[PDB]
Amino acid sequence: KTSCPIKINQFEGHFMKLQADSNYLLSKEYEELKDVGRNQSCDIALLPENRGKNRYNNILPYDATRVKLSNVCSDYINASYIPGNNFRREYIVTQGPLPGTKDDFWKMVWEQNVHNIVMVTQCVEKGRVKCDHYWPADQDSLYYGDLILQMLSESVLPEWTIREFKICGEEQLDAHRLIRHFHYTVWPDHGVPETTQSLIQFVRTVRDYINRSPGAGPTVVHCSAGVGRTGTFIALDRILQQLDSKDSVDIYGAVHDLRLHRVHMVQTECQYVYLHQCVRDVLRARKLR
Ligand SMILES: CNC(=O)[C@H](Cc1ccc(NS(=O)(=O)O)cc1)NC(=O)[C@H](Cc1ccc(O)cc1)NC(=O)OC(C)(C)C
Numbered sequence: 001k002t003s004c005p006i007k008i009n010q011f012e013g014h015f016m017k018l019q020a021d022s023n024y025l026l027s028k029e030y031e032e033l034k035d036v037g038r039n040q041s042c043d044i045a046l047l048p049e050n051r052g053k054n055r056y057n058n059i060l061p062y063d064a065t066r067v068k069l070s071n072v073c074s075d076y077i078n079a080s081y082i083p084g085n086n087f088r089r090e091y092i093v094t095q096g097p098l099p100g101t102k103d104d105f106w107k108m109v110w111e112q113n114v115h116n117i118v119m120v121t122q123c124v125e126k127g128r129v130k131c132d133h134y135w136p137a138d139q140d141s142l143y144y145g146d147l148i149l150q151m152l153s154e155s156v157l158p159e160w161t162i163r164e165f166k167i168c169g170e171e172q173l174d175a176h177r178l179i180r181h182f183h184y185t186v187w188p189d190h191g192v193p194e195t196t197q198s199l200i201q202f203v204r205t206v207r208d209y210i211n212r213s214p215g216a217g218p219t220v221v222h223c224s225a226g227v228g229r230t231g232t233f234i235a236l237d238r239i240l241q242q243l244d245s246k247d248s249v250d251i252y253g254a255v256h257d258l259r260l261h262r263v264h265m266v267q268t269e270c271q272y273v274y275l276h277q278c279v280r281d282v283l284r285a286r287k288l289r
Contacts, residue, residue: 001032003253011249011283015276023273029252030272036259040064049073053104055095059225065261067092069107070170077104079226080262081218082234089218091234093226093262096121096131103145105134109179110147110169113217116210119183120233121223130189130224135163135181146170152178159198160184160205182206187229190267192274196281199274203237228267231258235266235275243282251275 006014018026044050045060050073054060060078061067067079077094078101084090092112096119097105109117123131136142141150147169155162163181184202186193193199210216223229238254255272258265266272 002256003250004029005248005250005253007248008243008283009247011279015280018276026273027269030269033252033255033259036256037062037261037263044076045078047073050076053101054078055098056225059095059227059263061262067094067108067112069104070111077101077108079108082258082261092218092220093230093234093265094220094222095226096222096224097134099132102132102134103147106144106147106149106167107169109220110167111172113173114220115177115179115213115216116206117179117181117220117222118206118233119181119222120187120229121189122185125189125224135165159186160202180209182209189224190228192232192270196274196278199233199236200240200278200282203233203240207237207240226262227264228271231255231265231267232271232275234258236278239275239279240282243279249279251279
């Protein structure tokens with residue numbers, strides 16, 4: 001059971017049914033996803049030489065889908081590829097960079113031809129450090145390892161901040177590159193944004209920037225662990241594309257497919273409900289127009 005597609009003209013009713021009896025059928029469906037992917041090993045991530053490279057020693061990339069850095073255990077970063085419907089490597093999911101792994105993070109962005117980064121955590125959340133401030137504080141260039149980075153703009157909007165960076169690393173396919181960074185600043189850990197409208201607009205906005213680019217590379221998405229908030233963002237991106245393309249939508253299949261590639265993408269039942277509320281809301285709006 002890989003997939004549960006719902007005809008869009010039947011979604012409103014499907015979701016009502018799932019929501020009946022205090023989410024009885026919603027919870028049953030959600031729990032069917034619990035073990036997807038969990039047959040897979042993270043032996044490289046567990047090597048003692050890699051210990052300090054993991055923010056959370058229990059949140060590790062599967063061997064089968066991990067992102068590898070060029071050799072300098074020098075290859076290791078806590079990050080995982082997510083293939084697309086049409087081609088490999090549509091997303092890279094990663095943890096919030098650590099002070100000691102930020103050079104590795106930027107190496108990865110450089111080597112993987114990444115032009116867009118989506119961050120859906122704050123650096124400190126309820127007194128706990130969740131992510132290093134791994135980008136410059138101002139417009140003065142700085143080295144991260146053998147990569148030079150310079151912030152060209154920082155635009156603080158109501159619910160996200162967009163930064164543009166120029167980066168140069170060890171030359172392969174390119175020698176210098178503009179990167180955009182999308183930092184969504186209103187998503188509580190273990191929770192959901194306060195409205196569907198907010199994250200739907202964020203996803204649409206990011207996908208807009210992606211789609212308009214002559215060549216985007218994999219999009220890097222991270223929160224603190226690269227699990228709950230990253231999983232929910234990516235799922236919504238996929239499901240929104242489904243609604244713009246097809247007459248059915250498959251939230252269960254989207255989450256299923258993410259979990260094949262990194263541990264338990266989408267952390268909570270509430271996050272699963274929120275994806276359904278998003279789809280419900282888009283469809284209601286569209287029906288009237
Ligand atoms: C200090 N360590 C931690 O907090 C770790 C790692 C972690 C995971 C997910 C997130 N959220 S995020 O991925 O959105 O950044 C942050 C941190 N947390 C966990 O492992 C949490 C622990 C937890 C918290 C609350 C709850 O009700 C049940 C279980 N477990 C957990 O996320 O389990 C998965 C990996 C199977 C999804």
